[PDB]
Ligand binder design. Structure first.
Ligand SMILES: Nc1ncnc2c1ncn2[C@@H]1O[C@H](COP(=O)(O)OP(=O)(O)OC[C@H]2O[C@H](O)[C@H](O)[C@@H]2O)[C@@H](O)[C@H]1O
Ligand SMILES: Nc1ncnc2c1ncn2[C@@H]1O[C@H](COP(=O)(O)OP(=O)(O)OC[C@H]2O[C@H](O)[C@H](O)[C@@H]2O)[C@@H](O)[C@H]1O
Ligand SMILES: [Mn+2]
Ligand SMILES: [Mn+2]
Lengths: 154, 154
């Protein structure tokens, strides 16, 4: 039995007995490789005070399913379209939030549309090296993209 | 300039202009392989109403650094100790929270201590197959462990 403390724009804060629970819209993220570069994006994220390396990601809006949201945010954030394949999903931090991320692969990318969101094409090997040297932070989606590449796309 | 709406046990809810921000303690997670099985754990997570496949994880408590927290939660959740190596970190969902997870590898595991938290040794290949068939959900830490294994531990 959830009692609500806050109903907001992209989250609700609830108590469920002793548990603090943040309800959040589901998200999507897209892994895309071109000429050995992965498609990352960076934007200022006020929650962390910096711009981590992410892959294109967004929230699922009313009416959409994950595939449609993935197509939309790839086009909105990078101007690209591709052939999308569902990979897997994960709960970002299920000890306090229900946010679930659905991750897709994009292939055969084409420009459909010509630095709020900065597009950062970067070899995943270099992203991993920059992170190990302390030069860039990852979001979960960025790290999942780099690990998925090393596991399956070489 | 953050104004606080809620100060709680494992999170704070703040507004920073138009942004809803959840402050949260940093976390650790430990990837451990033994005889081709990865060390997963499962527990009921009221935020999601189910028990996703995770790897041993916990919050960093006052006084600790990530390595020490990782040692602690491995022992508390599974009764094991090992030789720990830092791998990488990630922000779980930097569009709304500052929670950061530090991920370690554990090797040479030994039992130091003899189903609140269920220990689930499982080959990562099988965890990935069960997830693809809809039989289990992943946390970010579980998915990162499975992807890291496939990338680097075969
Ligand atoms: N929603 C909550 N509200 C209030 N207290 C809680 C909650 N969840 C746990 N506790 C209390 O907080 C103590 C912390 O339990 P520890 O093992 O260090 O952490 P973890 O495994 O939960 O979270 C580790 C990560 O894994 C997941 O991705 C999480 O989202 C984190 O990112 C618990 O004993 C409870 O007393
Ligand atoms: N903290 C916030 N509070 C209020 N509104 C916000 C906030 N952040 C963004 N908006 C608004 O919400 C709209 C959503 O922007 P979209 O691209 O679909 O999502 P995403 O990239 O932010 O989040 C995608 C995932 O990546 C990260 O891991 C996140 O944590 C998510 O898990 C924005 O245009 C803003 O209008
Ligand atoms: Mn976005
Ligand atoms: Mn735990």
């Amino acid at each position: 039995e959830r009692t609500y403390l806050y109903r907001g724009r992209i989250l609700n804060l609830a108590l469920e007995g002793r548990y603090e629970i943040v309800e959040h819209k589901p998200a999507v993220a897209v892994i895309a490789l071109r000429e050995g570069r992965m498609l990352f994006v960076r934007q200022m994220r006020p929650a962390v005070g910096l711009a981590p390396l992410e892959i294109p990601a967004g929230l699922i809006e009313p009416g959409e399913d994950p595939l449609e949201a993935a197509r939309r945010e790839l086009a909105e954030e990078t101007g690209l379209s591709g052939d999308l394949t569902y990979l897997f999903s994960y709960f970002v931090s299920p000890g306090f939030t229900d946010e679930k991320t659905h991750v897709f692969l994009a292939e055969n990318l084409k420009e459909v549309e010509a630095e709020a969101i900065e597009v950062v094409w970067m070899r995943p090997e270099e992203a991993l090296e920059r992170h190990q040297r302390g030069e860039v932070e990852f979001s979960a989606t960025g790290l999942v993209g780099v690990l998925y590449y090393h596991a399956f796309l070489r």
